[PDB]
Amino acid sequence: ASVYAWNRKRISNCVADYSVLYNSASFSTFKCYGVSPTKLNDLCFTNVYA
Amino acid sequence: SALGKLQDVVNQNAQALNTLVKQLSSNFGAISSVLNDILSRLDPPEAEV
């Protein structure tokens, strides 16, 4: 979608695997604020917004 | 009410220790007030800040 009508997706009840995202080299920019990407696998979250 | 001079001595100490305990619940500008979450959520090169 366009910028002014950006979408938002609910994420819950997940065995989330962020290893595939970080290990992929297709992303030119991958910056995380407040969380280290390598530590994303250990943590648990109540809700995720995309 | 006669023993106030002896009771306040205990009261002041009780207040001081309590305020010392309360200081464990302050961020001081950091992202969390508990030391375990910082080490379990941030990279070693960054958590030192």
UniProtKB/Swiss-Prot annotation, chain B:
Residues 7-49 form a coiled coil. It comes from the Viruses. Changing L39F: In strain: Omicron/BA.1. Subunit of the fusion protein that is processed upon entry into the host cell. Mediates fusion of the virion and cellular membranes by functioning as a class I viral fusion protein. Contains a viral fusion peptide that is unmasked after S2 cleavage. This cleavage can occur at the cell membrane by host TMPRSS2 or during endocytosis by host CSTL. In either case, this triggers an extensive and irreversible conformational change that leads to fusion of the viral envelope with the cellular cytoplasmic membrane, releasing viral genomic RNA into the host cell cytoplasm. This is Spike protein S2'. It comes from Severe acute respiratory syndrome coronavirus 2 (2019-nCoV). The lineage of its organism: Viruses, Riboviria, Orthornavirae, Pisuviricota, Pisoniviricetes. The chain holds residues 943 to 991 of 1273 of the full protein.
